[PDB]
Design an enzyme around this catalytic site. Structure first.
Site, short mmCIF file in Angstrom:
data_model
loop_
_atom_site.label_atom_id
_atom_site.label_comp_id
_atom_site.label_asym_id
_atom_site.label_seq_id
_atom_site.Cartn_x
_atom_site.Cartn_y
_atom_site.Cartn_z
N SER A 146 0.79 -1.23 0.00
CA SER A 146 0.00 0.00 0.00
C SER A 146 0.82 1.28 0.00
O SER A 146 0.24 2.36 0.00
CB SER A 146 -0.99 0.07 1.14
N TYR A 171 -10.29 2.57 6.04
CA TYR A 171 -9.18 2.27 5.14
C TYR A 171 -9.62 1.24 4.11
O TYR A 171 -10.14 0.19 4.47
CB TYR A 171 -7.99 1.76 5.94
N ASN A 203 -8.90 -0.44 -0.20
CA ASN A 203 -8.36 -0.46 -1.56
C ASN A 203 -9.46 -0.10 -2.56
O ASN A 203 -9.17 0.47 -3.62
CB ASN A 203 -7.81 -1.83 -1.94
N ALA A 225 2.20 -3.30 2.88
CA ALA A 225 2.51 -4.71 2.96
C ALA A 225 1.82 -5.53 1.90
O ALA A 225 0.78 -5.14 1.37
CB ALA A 225 2.11 -5.24 4.35
N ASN A 260 6.68 -9.77 5.67
CA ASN A 260 5.65 -8.91 6.25
C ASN A 260 5.75 -9.09 7.77
O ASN A 260 5.57 -10.19 8.28
CB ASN A 260 4.25 -9.32 5.75
B1 LIG Z 1 -1.77 -2.14 2.17
O1 LIG Z 1 -0.39 -2.75 2.24
O2 LIG Z 1 -2.09 -1.53 3.47
C1 LIG Z 1 -2.78 -3.28 1.77
C2 LIG Z 1 -2.63 -4.00 0.52
C3 LIG Z 1 -3.55 -5.09 0.18
N1 LIG Z 1 -3.38 -5.83 -1.11
S1 LIG Z 1 -2.17 -7.03 -1.31
O3 LIG Z 1 -2.58 -7.87 -2.41
O4 LIG Z 1 -0.89 -6.36 -1.43
C4 LIG Z 1 -2.15 -8.06 0.13
C5 LIG Z 1 -1.80 -7.66 1.38
C6 LIG Z 1 -1.90 -8.75 2.32
S2 LIG Z 1 -1.52 -8.55 4.00
O5 LIG Z 1 -1.69 -9.77 4.68
O6 LIG Z 1 -0.31 -7.72 4.10
C7 LIG Z 1 -2.82 -7.55 4.72
C8 LIG Z 1 -2.54 -6.20 5.26
C9 LIG Z 1 -3.61 -5.40 5.85
C10 LIG Z 1 -4.98 -5.93 5.91
C11 LIG Z 1 -5.29 -7.25 5.39
C12 LIG Z 1 -4.22 -8.07 4.80
C13 LIG Z 1 -2.30 -9.91 1.77
S3 LIG Z 1 -2.60 -9.76 0.03
C14 LIG Z 1 -4.63 -5.43 1.14
C15 LIG Z 1 -5.57 -6.57 0.80
O7 LIG Z 1 -5.53 -7.29 -0.27
O8 LIG Z 1 -6.47 -6.84 1.66
C16 LIG Z 1 -4.76 -4.70 2.35
C17 LIG Z 1 -3.85 -3.64 2.67
#
Ligand SMILES: *[B]([O])([O])C1=[C]C([N]S(=O)(=O)C2=[C]C(S(=O)(=O)C3=[C][C]=[C][C]=[C]3)=[C]S2)=C(C([O])=O)[C]=[C]1
Ligand SMILES: *[B]([O])([O])C1=[C]C([N]S(=O)(=O)C2=[C]C(S(=O)(=O)C3=[C][C]=[C][C]=[C]3)=[C]S2)=C(C([O])=O)[C]=[C]1
Lengths: 358, 358
Positions: free
Chosen positions: A61, A147, A149, A315, A340
């Site tokens: 993000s 928050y 996406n 992340a 992560n």
């Molecule tokens: B951002 O980094 O705050 C973010 C990005 C995403 N999409 S993603 O496909 O990059 C993924 C992130 C994860 S995770 O486990 O780091 C996570 C972080 C925060 C909340 C839920 C999960 C797994 S795939 C997401 C997303 O896809 O939900 C959320 C936040």
């Protein structure tokens, strides 16, 4: 590489890497406007490839900061307005719940409860249309921050429509190139795959999976050198030649909403400096950063405040990133890891380092 | 000056001077960024003193554009926020009706009916305080626009509060001086009195009288070359070295509010270009310009639009002024006369000139 910086960075990062079991990391400290790099471990454990200043990391993000600036640049170009209704750029979004939802709301996660994730079932342009048409807000526009996406992701896709350019083409042409971010990608080219570090989740090597609005919400990969350059740009946008881009960066750092001691910008999030460590460290914890919080509107928004701690966590399944800077001190930091790990740990380490350098 | 400019100015302004019986006049046309000057008649009928590029005219409410920019500069300096309550800068204003009224409201005449004029009886700081403590709103804040010296006048006084400087000192050091307006004064010094033109009302020579908040609302006096310089600065602020002044000018041209086809900025008023001449000409009539009109909030404000007709009318008992420019075309005009003739006549003439030029 002043010893002052060398010592604090190594004394802080070394323990971090061991406690969190991070395979590889790269850090850059912007001190008095100049960058200093540091690297540790592996980008690819299997084939012992070390992390270098050219290793590409998934920003997760942190990509949202680029999206916020791209949008701000489109505003400075007079192509869009934050006051414009979401429907002005996507007429087929006729469902009544959209009526008073503006690009501002989409950009700042205050549309009324758009979900954190775009369902995996969504793919087609049509699938995306049904998703937003069928979505039911929980709150009125501009009352609560959640928050997501789905919000800023849509903001990014719509902000570039007037351009006639693809989101990616617009990002490389209006942001990457002008700033010399020659090793920052939305899609990693075959020629750069050798620099593409692997992410690690439960000991398995993984790369972020394709998804709707991925490019606009969490799809950028970069090097510690380009990220350092990204930080310098946001630190002193006045030194940028492209007028609209300089203006776009300033707009991304403006304060649009307040919740607690935190202010929401376009992608970036800010707090007054001097900041309270516990406020930013404990505030970074997902359980808090991802919760529904009522917001106070800043009418009109406050132009970028020099005395601010500007930052963003990011992340993916296998990477953890963090960026923070203080315009007034010409100080900043970037931390990229192919693992992560807890946001609080990232922010604590960053605070320990920057606070030591003033 | 190119015959194109000499031609349209001579055929437009000379007949105007005859029709309105203007004693003396100075006009400046900014074409492709460069200024061209024209002068007519006397600055002082008796003693037959001619109007020159050094003649000082009372600007009237055109002074409000200066107040707006000073305010914008204070915002850029981080000294004040348009989002802040009025009471934060005037702890003494405790009356309950002031809750919710911000600096933004004061600056854009949207406070809720503050009077056009500050009563002549009001002189002391004491008189001023009870005057505002006793004011009762005609409408809720942020709903109606009522042009008034009482609003923007108070905005100016409070905007400089954080600096500790007087209004005149703040304006001189932060605006006049950095822009090289070396013949622009709030209080005309002895050495410049010989250049201070007399205003004419019913044949009698007159100068504007002192009054509470006069400096902030209608107290500026300037020459045609200083004003051309003022227009040039507002035409393209990116050429101004002082960072906060550059931003302050851009903030003064942002669109905070909309009523009909016009937008309210800080001091400046704007319309999209191309504009309907009938709109700005008839809209200038005081029967309209001084009337309350409902406003639509632009959330958030639209940053200064290049394709805009930016302008402001101004007058005192013996003077009549007008300034207008189009950023996108690096085109502008300044009209100063020592006679207060109808706004519509000023605007019609100005439109004839700029429309012929682009
Ligand atoms: B951002 O980094 O705050 C973010 C990005 C995403 N999409 S993603 O496909 O990059 C993924 C992130 C994860 S995770 O486990 O780091 C996570 C972080 C925060 C909340 C839920 C999960 C797994 S795939 C997401 C997303 O896809 O939900 C959320 C936040
Ligand atoms: B502004 O020029 O729009 C303006 C200025 C003032 N203050 S003043 O003391 O300079 C006076 C102006 C007049 S006037 O008759 O030229 C006039 C112009 C426009 C609207 C009403 C009156 C007389 S004193 C005022 C003010 O009320 O004092 C209003 C507008």
């Amino acid at each position: 590489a002043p010893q002052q910086i060398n010592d604090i960075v190594h004394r802080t990062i070394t323990p971090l890497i061991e406690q969190q079991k991070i395979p590889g990391m790269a850090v850059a400290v912007i001190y008095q406007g100049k960058p200093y790099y540091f690297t540790w471990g592996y980008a690819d454990i299997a084939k012992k490839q070390p992390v270098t200043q050219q290793t590409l990391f998934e920003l997760g993000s942190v990509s949202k900061t680029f999206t916020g600036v791209l949008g701000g640049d489109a505003i400075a170009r007079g192509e869009i307005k934050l006051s414009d209704p979401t429907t002005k750029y996507w007429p087929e979004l006729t469902a009544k719940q959209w009526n008073g939802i503006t690009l501002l709301h989409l950009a700042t996660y205050t549309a009324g409860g758009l979900p954190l994730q775009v369902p995996d079932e969504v793919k087609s342009s049509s699938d995306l249309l049904r998703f937003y048409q069928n979505w039911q807000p929980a709150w009125a526009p501009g009352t609560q921050r959640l928050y997501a996406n789905s919000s800023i992701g849509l903001f990014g896709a719509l902000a570039v429509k007037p351009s006639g350019l693809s989101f990616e083409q617009a990002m490389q042409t209006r942001v990457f190139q002008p700033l010399k971010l020659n090793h920052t990608w939305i899609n990693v080219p075959p020629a750069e795959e050798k620099n593409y570090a692997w992410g690690y989740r439960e000991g398995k090597a993984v790369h972020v999976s394709p998804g709707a609005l991925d490019a606009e919400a969490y799809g950028v990969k970069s090097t510690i050198e380009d990220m350092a350059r990204w930080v310098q740009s946001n630190l002193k946008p006045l030194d940028i030649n492209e007028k609209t881009l300089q203006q776009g960066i300033q707009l991304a750092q403006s304060r649009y909403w307040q919740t607690g001691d935190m202010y929401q910008g376009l992608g970036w999030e800010m707090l007054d400096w001097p900041v309270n460590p516990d406020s930013i460290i404990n505030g970074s914890d997902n359980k808090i950063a991802l919760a529904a919080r009522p917001v106070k509107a800043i009418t009109p928004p406050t132009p970028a405040v020099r005395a601010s701690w500007v930052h963003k966590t990011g992340a993916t399944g296998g990477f953890g990133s963090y960026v923070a800077f203080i315009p007034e001190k010409e100080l900043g930091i970037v931390m990229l890891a192919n693992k992560n790990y807890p946001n609080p740990a990232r922010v604590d380490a960053a605070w320990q380092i920057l606070n030591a350098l003033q």
